[PDB]
């Protein structure tokens, strides 16, 4: 229902490294500029009626100072990816950040952490297998729609638009199942340089296409 | 070039026919010539696998091509849900696959009533049955295992996806299989896509 027609944008945030290298700066400087650019994109999305923004870094700190900021901007924060590998002391900080913002009615921000598109499909398959083994589910009852409701973000609007910054033309095992019908938009802009007009240019391409 | 498996979303036959001031079937006919050209180019340049997606009448056309593909040592495979198709067409698919299955040159996969989500689902249903029989535990299911249950698992991974016709979408073509593939979009309409276009795509992959 916004004029650009875009409910859910996903972004592969590539370019932090060469951005830093361009300035004779080490990579960490680029990742810091990258975090700034995330803040900028989150604010842009929320102000342009986007329901969901899903971000892929192609964190251990970020999730606390940012969380207060996100929360103040009425953003609902979710983390997608294999977070079982993580230590359960900051696994705790993840769940705390999620429940703290779970009530917010603005943008839903999904952050990919130890996320893979193939993994995403496989964890959903494992849940279906568990139901099969418990006797609930019959194998031939499994269809697209059912698997669809077991992959990440099934409860949000389908992904309308995938943006990849940084010049490369691949998905790199980001969303796979979820992008079957998504518009794909590639720009050479390095992620730290990606701004409101770049984002606006992406949405306008989506609307025009 | 290093490109072992190319997949192509062949879009634009209809729009092309219109620009020519001709009917759609004329576009399809030019589409088929472009397929021949793409298949020969792939085999000529040492590409191991070529996977083609049209975006029951169309695979019938390839039946008269089978003799020639076989002589060119091409392995022909149809991927997708052919259970739909009339049993006569299904048997001819079966026969053409069997005739060429032992060939060792280009493997040419034709997507017919294919969908990427469907493809994954078929593998899921297979794994699910193994679970139901106690032959497989849920937590034992991993990427490698599901990979062995989706189309083309025995071929080189897809290196490059070409989509003609100007749209920037996968359109529920290969999904699992293109996780790390280079994606190449061109405005050229599929009946115009020639050897130079194809090489242009290989060049993009080369960097």
UniProtKB/Swiss-Prot annotation, chain B:
It comes from the Bacteria. Gene3D superfamilies: Decaprenyl diphosphate synthase-like. It holds the Pfam family Prenyltransf. Binds 2 magnesium ions per subunit. Changing residue 182 to A: Great decrease in activity; reduced affinity for IPP. Great decreases in the catalytic efficiency and in the affinity for IPP. Homodimer. NCBIfam families: PRK10240.1, PRK14830.1, uppS. Belongs to the UPP synthase family. This is Ditrans,polycis-undecaprenyl-diphosphate synthase ((2E,6E)-farnesyl-diphosphate specific). The gene is ispU.
């Amino acid at each position: 229902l916004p004029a650009h027609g875009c409910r859910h944008v996903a972004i592969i945030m590539d370019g932090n490294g060469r951005w830093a290298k361009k300035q004779g700066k080490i990579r960490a400087f680029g990742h810091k500029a990258g975090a700034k650019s995330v803040r900028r994109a989150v604010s842009f999305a929320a102000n342009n009626g986007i329901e969901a923004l899903t971000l892929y870094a192609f964190f251990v700190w970020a999730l606390d100072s940012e969380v207060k900021s996100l929360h103040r901007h009425n953003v609902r924060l979710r983390i997608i990816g294999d977070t079982s590998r993580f230590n359960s002391r900051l696994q705790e900080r993840i769940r705390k950040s999620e429940a703290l913002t779970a009530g917010n009615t603005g943008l839903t921000l999904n952050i990919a952490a130890n996320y893979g598109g193939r993994w995403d499909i496989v964890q959903g398959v494992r849940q279906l297998a568990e139901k099969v083994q418990q006797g609930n589910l019959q194998p031939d009852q499994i269809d697209e729609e059912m698997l669809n409701q077991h992959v990440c973000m099934h409860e949000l609007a389908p992904v309308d638009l995938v943006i990849r910054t940084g010049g490369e033309h691949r998905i790199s095992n980001f969303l796979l199942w979820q992008i079957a019908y998504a518009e794909l938009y590639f720009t050479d802009v390095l992620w730290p340089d990606f701004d409101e007009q770049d984002f606006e240019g992406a949405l306008n391409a989506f609307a025009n296409r």
